[PDB]
């Protein structure tokens, strides 16, 4: 229970940080102004 | 409180999964691969 | 789609950091 919840939070946070990096790259690939 | 937060982490992980799907779609759309 | 995605990713991050704080407060209560 507690440790499992903590591990899922860490899984979630790394996923979110990778999503944040992908969004930044994509914005650069789109090349809007 | 424990099941409220267990449910919350599953809800956010599901959101992250659908956002990863969207990142893969946007890379295909912008010309990548 | 690009802006919609950026906004959803910002909401995800915000929600996940708030959840992390909540989980740490719960860990103080349940220990382990």
C partners (3+ CB pairs within 8 A) are A, B
This entry's atomic model was obtained through: X-ray
Written in H, E and C, the secondary structure of A1-33 is: CHHHHHHHHHHHHHHHHHHHHHHHHHHHHHCCC
Query: Structure tokens of C29?
Result: 């209560």
Dist. CA C29–CA C26, nearest whole Å: 5
**CB of B23 within 8 A of CB of A26?**
yes
Which residue bears the tokens 């789609």?
C1
Helix (H) or strand (E) holding B25: helix B2-30
Q: A11 and B13 in contact by Cβ < 8 A?
A: yes
Q: Chain C: give the shortest CA distance to residue B33, in Å.
A: 18
Write b or e for each residue in C4-14: b if 16 or more Cβ atoms lie within 10 A of its Cβ, otherwise e: ebbebbeebee
C1: number of CA atoms within 13 Å, CB side?
13
**CB of C5 within 8 A of CB of B25?**
no
Give the number of other Cβ atoms within 10 Å of residue C1's Cβ. Answer: 12
- Name, in order, each residue with C-beta under 8 angstroms of B23's C-beta and a sequence gap of 6 or more: A19, A22, A23, A26, C5
Q: A26 and C16 in contact by Cβ < 8 A?
A: no
Partner residue opposite B26 with nearest CB, options C1, C15, C29: C1
A partners (3+ CB pairs within 8 A) are B, C
């Amino acid at each position: 229970r507690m440790k499992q919840l903590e591990d899922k939070v860490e899984e979630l946070l790394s996923k979110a940080y990778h999503l944040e990096n992908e969004v930044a790259r994509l914005k650069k690939l789109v090349g809007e102004r």
